[PDB]
Paper text:
These structural features are conserved in the permuted macrodomain found in Dictyostelium APL, indicating that the permutation does not drastically alter the structure of the domain. The macrodomain of APL has undergone a circular permutation. Most notably they retain an amino acid (D175 and E439) at an equivalent position to D723 of human ALC1 and D20 of Archaeoglobus fulgidus AF1521 that is crucial for ADP-ribose binding. Overall, these data indicate that although the macrodomain has undergone a circular permutation, it has retained its tertiary structure and its ability to interact with ADP-ribose. Strikingly, deletion of the macrodomain almost totally eliminates enrichment of APL in chromatin in response to cisplatin.
Through an in silico approach to identify new macrodomain-containing proteins in this organism, we identify a protein containing regions of similarity to aprataxin, APLF and PNKP that we call APL (aprataxin/APLF-and-PNKP-like protein). Interestingly, the N- and C-termini of the APL macrodomain align with the C- and N-termini of human macrodomains, respectively, indicating it has undergone a circular permutation during evolution.
Numbering used by the authors: 1 to 221
The structure:
């Protein structure tokens, strides 16, 4: 759970099969209940940090999936403000109806991130994803790779490719996903595991570290 920060790596020439195209949620904002003003600033700033560092790397495509309820003109303006009116062409926000909507899966990204918990198991919010992967198969592969389970602020990539049991998933074969990344963002919701208290001094630092971890995974990926 120790904070490690960004470990980003510039790549000018890349393998098209290893393109850094990531679909990811607006971490901790819906079910987890993270303060949206705070999540917006952290998200926008982390995104801009990564994209600026990687100026001129055109393989990178970032698609942030935002639930309809949270999506607003004010939200988009807030992002614009953090980007100093220079919104990077490589970053898009995609409105989805809810965390289980089918529209989220065919966005053309080789890496697909989902929120998870320490258990690294299916949640009610990513049920649809897990049905598509086959729950038992994916959970078994997850447990084999990460036998000591997950820590808040970290991500856990699982390849659908090198993974024999998952290669035939619609997610891989039809929707072009190579890697599913389980993202352990900060939960603020008393009804979900490992809830942080409202003014925890660790909440903001750990959400940022979640983004760093995610983008570190992308740069390896």
């Amino acid at each position: 759970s120790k904070i490690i920060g960004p470990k980003y790596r510039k790549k000018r020439l890349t393998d098209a099969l290893k393109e850094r195209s990531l679909a990811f949620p607006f971490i901790s904002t819906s079910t987890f209940g993270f303060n949206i003003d705070d999540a917006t600033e952290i998200s926008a700033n982390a995104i801009s940090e990564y994209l600026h560092f990687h100026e001129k790397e055109d393989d990178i495509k970032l698609k942030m999936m935002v639930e309809k309820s949270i999506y607003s003109d004010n939200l988009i303006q807030s992002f614009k403000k953090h980007f100093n009116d220079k919104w990077d062409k490589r970053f898009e926000i995609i409105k989805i109806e809810n965390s289980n909507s089918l529209e989220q899966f065919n966005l053309g990204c080789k890496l697909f991130a989902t929120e998870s918990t320490w258990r690294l198991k299916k949640t009610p919010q990513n049920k649809q994803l897990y049905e598509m992967l086959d729950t038992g198969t994916f959970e078994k592969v997850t447990k084999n790779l990460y036998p000591n389970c997950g820590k808040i602020g970290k991500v856990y990539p699982i390849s659908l490719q090198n993974n024999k049991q998952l290669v035939n998933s619609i997610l891989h074969k039809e929707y072009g996903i190579d890697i599913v990344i389980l993202v352990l963002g900060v939960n603020m919701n008393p009804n979900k595991p490992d809830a942080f208290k409202e003014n925890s001094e660790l909440a903001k630092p750990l959400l940022l570290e979640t983004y760093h971890s995610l983008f570190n995974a992308l740069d390896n990926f």
